[PDB]
């Protein structure tokens, strides 16, 4: 208290000091279900890929290890990650991930990025500007390029319109390039949109074939499909959780709220995920934050005494701050787990102040008609209910009058503020040195 007040002595009164939080005890990571999850990966290291405009699809889900394999998949490859950190892929359960594999030349590798232009970037492949995910591109000269010329891979250049992110065009119709009508016949003002690739091991790296794999995760709700590492439940204690990705701390408990079969998570009129269904045992949980609360100190003033009694505002202390473990709470001082007496008020509850019945006038306000003071029960801190004043019954009667016979010329005083200090500032002096 005197630390927050920045003074060596304090006065009679209750001073807010800090906040009290029940620290989590354990860690619950149920990261999958009755089974596991995986991306099947593998594809990464393979030869027969597809054309630039032929990215692949992989609704990968549950089977092998999501990761810890593909650092060695090839000597060198591209690891450009948008959003998630490259060191944190194994621990993040991506739900919706899209795996696109295709072959482009080295020169157009830089064109595989949001906000890029070129033969492929403008027309063939478009990456969204809000893209989150990673892209894998490695030199596949010694598995794609053919000595006689691997023309199986192809690219599109004479395309009229741009594609949207993850848009495709399988049509190989003749492109109408100019004013002269073609009627579907290539010739004047008409080029074939598709062009073959010159793929041969004896070629420049810029023109060398590069198998390009794109990972497009989606980092929001719904069940996931990929996370390397996990079990246990915990049903009544404040414990950290990692429900298939959702990372946070709360008190797990049973939920009487009924989920529809498709309902994965729950909420309230808030941001918090008030309810989550277990990744396994399809149980409806009632995730709630631990029992925290502001802690305030009631002191009669250092000068009078150095004994204090603390108040845990907004806490039912039948069990939360009385059964505090060794430094399980930010206040610490576990010797004050019970102290002198514990009393439950309507403004939290009182620790170290003994409740009495003899109501007095308010000395140190608490709340809900409770005050504290330091006097005899041989001096301690009491928690008397407020006394509103002396109960005086006026002897009213239909025929009786009370008339003063004397007087006192009382001279009271009153203090009223009138003006404050006339301060002035200076931007150029203050904001800028």
């Amino acid at each position, epitope marked *: 208290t005197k630390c927050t007040l920045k003074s060596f002595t304090v006065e009679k009164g209750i001073y807010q000091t800090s906040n009290f939080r029940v620290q989590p005890t354990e860690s619950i990571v149920r990261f999958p279900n009755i089974t596991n999850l995986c991306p099947f990966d593998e594809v990464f290291n393979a030869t027969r890929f597809a054309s630039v405009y032929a990215w692949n699809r992989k609704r990968i889900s549950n089977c092998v290890a999501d990761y810890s394999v593909l650092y060695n998949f090839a000597p060198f490859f591209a690891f*450009k990650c948008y959003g998630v950190s490259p060191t944190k892929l194994n621990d993040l359960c991506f739900t919706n991930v899209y795996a696109d594999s295709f072959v482009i030349r080295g020169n157009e590798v830089s064109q595989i990025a949001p906000g890029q232009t070129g033969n492929i970037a403008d027309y063939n492949y478009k990456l969204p500007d809000d893209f989150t995910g990673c892209v894998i591109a490695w030199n596949s000269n010694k598995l794609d390029s053919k000595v006689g010329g691997n023309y199986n891979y192809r690219y599109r250049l004479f395309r009229k319109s741009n594609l949207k992110p993850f848009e495709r065009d399988i049509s190989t119709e003749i492109y109408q390039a100019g004013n002269k009508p073609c009627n579907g016949v290539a010739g004047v003002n008409c080029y074939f949109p598709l062009q073959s690739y010159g793929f041969r091991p004896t070629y420049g790296v810029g023109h060398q074939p590069y198998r390009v794999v794109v990972l497009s995760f989606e980092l929001l709700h719904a069940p996931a499909t990929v996370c390397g590492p996990s079990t246990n439940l915990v049903k009544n204690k404040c414990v950290n959780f990692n429900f298939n990705g959702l990372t946070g701390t709360g008190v797990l408990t049973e939920s009487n709220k009924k989920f529809l079969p498709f309902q994965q998570f729950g909420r309230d009129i808030a941001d918090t995920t008030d309810a989550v269904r277990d990744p396994q045992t399809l149980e409806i949980l009632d995730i709630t934050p631990c029992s925290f609360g502001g802690v305030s100190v009631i002191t009669p003033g250092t000068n009078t005494s150095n004994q204090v009694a603390v108040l845990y505002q907004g806490v039912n202390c039948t069990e939360v701050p009385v059964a505090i473990h060794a430094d399980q709470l930010t206040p610490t001082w576990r010797v004050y787990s019970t102290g002198s007496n514990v009393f439950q008020t309507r403004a939290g509850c009182l620790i170290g102040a003994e409740y009495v019945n003899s109501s007095y006038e308010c000395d140190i306000p608490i709340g809900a008609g409770i005050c504290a003071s330091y006097q005899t029960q041989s001096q301690s801190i009491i928690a008397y209910t407020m006394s509103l004043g002396a109960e005086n019954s006026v002897a009213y009667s239909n025929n009786s009058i009370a008339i003063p016979t004397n007087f006192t010329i009382s001279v009271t005083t009153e203090i009223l503020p009138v003006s404050m200090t006339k301060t002035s500032v200076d931007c150029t002096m203050y904001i800028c040195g």
Partner: nanobody
Amino acid sequence: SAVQLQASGGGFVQPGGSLRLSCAASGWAETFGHMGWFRQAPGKEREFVSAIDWWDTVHYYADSVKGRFTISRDNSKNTVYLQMNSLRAEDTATYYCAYWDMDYLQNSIPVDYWGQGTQVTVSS
């Protein structure tokens, strides 16, 4: 990111001699960076030497290395060389094959990854 670089070459060159260095690339990188050597003169601060891009489209040279330095990357094993033409006698230094994990080299001072040094003396 974590990139392991395999640099090799060196020996004992003479005034007017030449080198054919090498620097193989392996490992995953956040971006397809450009290889090169980032050499200090003996007792001097580290300095940029010569740059080649992964696409074989961008080349860089410096005044202290002009006319006697050239960088080229192999198309087969992806080991970038340092082809030489009449190296002078004052290149008795250790050549470090550093790595810049950026698609464009706006400034050469920030280097993402370092390689192995190649100590070659130029004397007869």
